[PDB]
């Protein structure tokens with residue numbers, strides 16, 4: 738029952754590959770549904786064409802700011818922000834998909850994909866999914882990051898949807 742969504746990643750416009758995610762709607766249905774709908778675009782906005790604005794090798798890839806493209810924007814399907822649904826799931830290692838935020842109960846559309854175990858974020862960021870196929874593509878994206886997170890090539894979600 739858990740939805741599978743995919744991102745087709747491009748690097749300076751050149752196709753790199755596909756990442757697919759399992760969304761844990763059985764544990765975090767509201768958070769899963771937000772990401773699922775932003776990945777299909779069915780509400781009229783979402784992730785297609787957006788970029789990954791911060792990539793830190795050995796930590797995480799951050800994206801989902803489809804309104805300001807720099808970490809300051811994005812919005813949920815429910816409004817600007819929604820609650821931390823729960824913290825049942827933990828940041829157990831690479832491939833974990835979790836919500837970025839600016840404080841308690843401020844989820845929008847920004848998310849991050851862990852490339853390492855990030856247990857210090859447990860209880861503060863809502864984990865809602867995990868990479869299914871294409872962790873090697875996330876590892877490839879990682880190489881275009883830097884210590885301060887600035888990317889050396891433009892990493893975009895060229896296409897996305899539900900599988």
Ligand SMILES: COC(=O)[C@@H]1CCCN(C(=O)[C@H](Cc2cccc(O)c2)NC(=O)[C@@H](NC(C)=O)C(C)C)N1
Nearest residue numbers: 791797799808809810836837838839847848849886
């Ligand atoms: C260098 O680390 C980050 O940039 C982190 C990685 C996880 C996702 N994330 C956020 O949720 C960060 C908070 C954070 C968490 C952990 C470490 C940090 O330095 C900063 N938040 C943001 O980027 C948001 N808010 C602000 C005020 O920056 C944006 C979603 C509207 N950014």
